[PDB]
Amino acid sequence: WKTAEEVAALIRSPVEEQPKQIIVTRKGMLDPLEVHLLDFPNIVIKGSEFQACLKVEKFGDLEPQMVLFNLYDDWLKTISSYTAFSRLILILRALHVNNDRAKVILKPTTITEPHHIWPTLTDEEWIKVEVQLKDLILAD
Amino acid sequence: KRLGQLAKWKTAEEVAALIRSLPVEEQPKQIIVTRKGMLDPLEVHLLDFPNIVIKGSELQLPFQACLKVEKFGDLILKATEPQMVLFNLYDDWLKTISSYTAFSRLILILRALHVNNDRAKVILKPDKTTITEPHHIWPTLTDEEWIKVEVQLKDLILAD
Fold first, then answer.
1. By residue range, what is the domain housing residue B17?
2. N or C: chain B end with fewer CB closer than 10 Å?
3. Which one of B33, B51, B82 has the shortest CB-CB distance to A68?
4. Which cysteine pairs are joined by S-S bonds (chain A)?
5. Based on the structure, what is the number of domains in chain B?
């Protein structure tokens, strides 16, 4: 990937080997993506942003990009699939019942990693959050 | 239906047609500038639960309108707001069913995908002509079709 300035330098690089037109593609969604479910039931997918963001080739020289997230982030390092499923559905149910209050519970400096959809919390912080989400649902 | 691309955007096929109408000597000259990032429409699904799979479009896909033709010179490329796309875990269900009913259906599908992912995917495709809209994550099903699928997913969970 090249910068605007580097592409301009390749272009004027001619003299009438230069075409009368240039073909330009529309801007896509800039990876890495930010994905979250905090606006449940919506899934929000956001792109990023002298940037190196261009390629220039012969039109004549003509697989889709795939990005993975995980509804469990990295939890399966610590906990079972059963426990993970249970935590996920509890979070979704809380977001469903009381979206504003759930979002506050999940942000008790609390950080969600760029490649994660849920905050980074210790085992003991998750226990406290689970108690709070349950109380949120019971208060409905 | 998501808002498509404006008139100025040509498909790779349309631009290729333009090029082929030029003097043959001019055709190998033609240059394309590609912008980094994944091209929309995005395709999203949860069938590889717990993974969320997000797939971009490709520049040469049939009817992918993504190319502009401008006069040769200094390129004019305007920095802009980052793209944001919204999908919905309930697709369009809330047009006909309540939030309670949609939540219940959602968690039933997730539970089946958790319990028996291969069988759940088959249940979610009851017919060679079962499709999922490009802006949807679940199949387009009639109300009878959803009733049957919910029965089958429950039977899947009970069998394991």
1. 1-160
2. N
3. B51
4. none
5. 1
